Amino acid sequence: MKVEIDSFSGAKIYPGRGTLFVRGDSKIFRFQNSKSASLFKQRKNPRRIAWTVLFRKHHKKGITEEVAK
């Protein structure tokens, strides 16, 4: 059992949890829940939903000591 990362939010997915979708480009996509899965279907840029991980990474949101080596 390895660690797989959500494709839209970035939260860790436990076995038996989440969904999985394959696009026409044959590139993989994993969603932790219908909240993240349906949000992807609406073609939402995930850099703009506040509670995702890519949003907080972009705006150094709560980075604290992670910005320091």
Partner: protein, 136 residues
């Protein structure tokens, strides 16, 4: 299953009843396939015999290069676009339906396959995996 389908397949969700239209996945010149029946079905009043990933069915070409029409010809399902559960614990699905032309012996009339192919189909049918492209 069916004749020539060596090995066994674990049951998955049925999402292709009689009368479905499936995109042509292989370079046989066809554009779509119209499922008329499935192999190894059951017998229940008012139940459409449905298909699934890796299953082999016969489907006419309602829209394609001419002499592939007006006749029945078997095919193999390579995409389902319907959420099915694997044993490993994943609920996955594809973007759209897709099938490949294949005579009853199990080999393919076409040469190549465009788009992802479910490994539940590659494993069950060796010749499909022989001419398959992306594998999940």
């Amino acid at each position: 299953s069916g004749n020539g389908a060596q090995g066994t397949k674990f049951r998955i969700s049925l999402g292709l009843p009689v009368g479905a239209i499936m995109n042509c996945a292989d370079n046989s010149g066809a554009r779509n396939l119209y499922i008329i029946a499935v192999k190894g079905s059951g017998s229940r009043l008012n139940r459409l015999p449905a298909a699934s990933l890796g299953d082999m069915v016969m489907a006419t070409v309602k829209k394609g290069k001419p002499e592939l029409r007006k006749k029945v010809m078997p095919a193999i399902v390579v995409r389902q676009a319907k959420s099915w559960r694997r044993r490993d614990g994943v609920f996955l699905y594809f973007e759209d339906n897709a099938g490949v032309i294949a005579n009853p012996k199990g080999e393919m009339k076409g040469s190549a396959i465009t788009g992802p192919v479910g490994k539940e189909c590659a494993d069950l049918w060796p010749r499909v995996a022989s001419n398959s492209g992306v594998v999940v």
